[PDB]
Design a protein around this ligand. Structure first.
Ligand SMILES: Nc1ncnc2c1ncn2[C@@H]1O[C@H](COP(=O)(O)OP(=O)(O)OP(=O)(O)O)[C@@H](O)[C@H]1O
Ligand SMILES: Nc1ncnc2c1ncn2[C@@H]1O[C@H](COP(=O)(O)OP(=O)(O)OP(=O)(O)O)[C@@H](O)[C@H]1O
Ligand SMILES: [K+]
Ligand SMILES: [K+]
Ligand SMILES: [Zn+2]
Ligand SMILES: [Zn+2]
Lengths: 309, 305
């Protein structure tokens, strides 16, 4: 019996935030309680979008309702994109209260702030969120899934190589989370320029005070398209697989990355078919084919091997 | 590839409204766009509840977003509990607009009315909603899932026997919906007093008519969201068996039985011995009934009337 409290955005159509995360965890057997931080018609990749947002006060209201009914017991808390600092600070109060009641609670956090869109690096959020992520969110997180840019920002250090990447991940471990996964980087991969390189690290303190650190590298073949909600889907499946393989980051990452590959291959195939030959698929046509990937999400065939570093 | 627009309530914890309908439809292979009419912490069966309600203007603002992006093309529309007549009217406008764009669109409606436990923080459904359902909603609905009390209100008639029911169901057809299903009645099953009787009727312009009856053994507990789970699965099964309401209902009702059995068993297991299960312990074991929803073992035989 595992219950997850997921606080993320919601869209009527498409897959992003809680939409990208709920279905996967449900088919994997987790009980998901979903707080929708906002409700829009579709993601911001489209030309238009309309919806409402929740302020930190409304969030607190929803939590008080769970608390008043004595059902505020969770095994996992999962958060992603957040645009306002009050909301984020409010989330930390919540995570801390819950951890006070369940020391075994695991907080999976995807510190969303930006990327380097093919050599294009800029922020998605107000510069005032970074201090909150740095000083208040990271310290209580158990698993974080930043991309290169977010790892550089959290540590204030820049990554130019695989070696510096590992140092940055160590600095992150020192900030709190025992598990760190850099989901994507600008790093050149040894298998080819067309491969995306991911890196993972899981720290473990031994009884005698010694520290064991499992580090792994992953190389996935790039799909020529820009997807949305990919980081959310990743964080959600990583939570499920790390649960099953608690002390094996290797297998957890392999199962997670394999599933991504299957979902995306099914998505790019359907998008090109729906947009005609020659024509480039539109954001509407590139929405993740979540529902049709059920079997692949439940039991993915492994198609990527993690290299132990 | 089918796409469903479901406009219902959302609750952080538990299953009612959209929470009871989405997972089921998704595992059955349907693309579900969900508009959450409200967002509460839990349903009204609990001692407390907090949340916010979405007004009709906000509902229009969302649908507009879908329109501007030319992605407002659906195959089904699914609605349930509403306590705002203003919101309900906006839903009818949205449906007629969608039906003009796709005449083949199917509107599945569960006209909720009464002192029902729900996910919109309400203690009752305003009496002033009845005339809205009667005149604006039902004429546009293709499949309706009223319970006996609701059917009686929509027709002004009162059901005292099995013949009386078929009589009301026919009236409902004439009002618009080609498929009607009275989900539960006070009617005494010949099978015993511990069985709940459900009646179903379906018209096909060959105009033909198929009527059915089902006995379901009562479960000694009070559940919330069952009406929502029913409508959602009926939607899926009617799609797979378009002209066979017998088979469609048999699978829907079977799935239901499996979910409730798994729910009552776990609830008693989690509560102390001789301790009555609390609403929180009675929340539907949805995620764990995945295989039973995808492929339910038939445990009921619908008799053709
Ligand atoms: N084009 C792609 N080809 C292959 N895998 C991809 C692609 N885009 C995303 N992914 C996969 O999705 C997961 C998350 O990707 P990435 O690290 O780019 O996300 P992100 O920058 O956090 O996402 P977002 O910007 O949408 O929040 C990774 O496991 C990655 O392999
Ligand atoms: N105690 C029970 N035992 C067996 N089946 C039940 C029970 N309660 C509900 N159901 C099943 O749930 C479905 C809907 O039942 P019911 O007539 O109570 O719904 P409703 O009035 O639409 O629901 P709601 O409580 O959401 O208003 C039917 O298929 C019915 O058999
Ligand atoms: K990420
Ligand atoms: K009903
Ligand atoms: Zn991201
Ligand atoms: Zn009902």
């Amino acid at each position: 019996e595992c219950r997850v409290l997921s606080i993320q955005s919601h869209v009527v159509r498409g897959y992003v935030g809680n939409r990208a995360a709920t279905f996967p965890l449900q088919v994997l057997g987790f009980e998901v309680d979903a707080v929708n931080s906002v409700q829009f018609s579709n993601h911001t990749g489209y030309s238009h979008w309309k919806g409402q947002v929740l302020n930190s006060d409304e969030l607190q209201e929803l939590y008080d309702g769970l608390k008043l009914n004595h059902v505020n017991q969770y095994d996992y808390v999962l958060t992603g994109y957040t645009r306002d600092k009050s909301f984020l600070a409010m989330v930390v109060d919540i995570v801390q209260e819950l951890k006070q009641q369940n020391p075994r609670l695991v907080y999976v956090c995807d510190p969303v702030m930006g990327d380097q869109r093919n050599g294009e690096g800029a922020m998605y959020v107000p510069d005032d969120l970074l201090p909150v992520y740095r000083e208040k969110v990271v310290p209580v997180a158990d698993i974080i899934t930043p991309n290169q840019f977010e790892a550089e920002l959290l540590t204030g250090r820049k990554i130019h190589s695989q070696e510096e990447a590992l140092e940055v991940m160590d600095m992150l471990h020192s900030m709190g989370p025992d598990t760190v996964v850099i989901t994507s980087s600008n790093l050149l991969s040894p298998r080819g320029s067309d491969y995306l390189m991911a890196l993972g690290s899981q720290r473990t303190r031994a009884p005698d005070g010694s520290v064991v650190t499992q580090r792994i590298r992953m190389e996935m073949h790039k799909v020529d398209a820009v997807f949305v909600g990919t980081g959310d889907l990743f964080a959600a499946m990583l939570l499920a697989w790390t649960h099953k393989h608690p002390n094996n980051l290797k297998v957890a990452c392999e199962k997670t990355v394999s599933a991504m590959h299957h979902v995306l291959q099914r998505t790019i195939k359907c998008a090109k078919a729906k947009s005609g030959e020659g024509v480039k698929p539109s954001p509407a046509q590139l929405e993740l084919r979540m529902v049709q990937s059920k079997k692949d999400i439940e039991s993915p065939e492994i198609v990527v091997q993690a290299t132990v570093l």
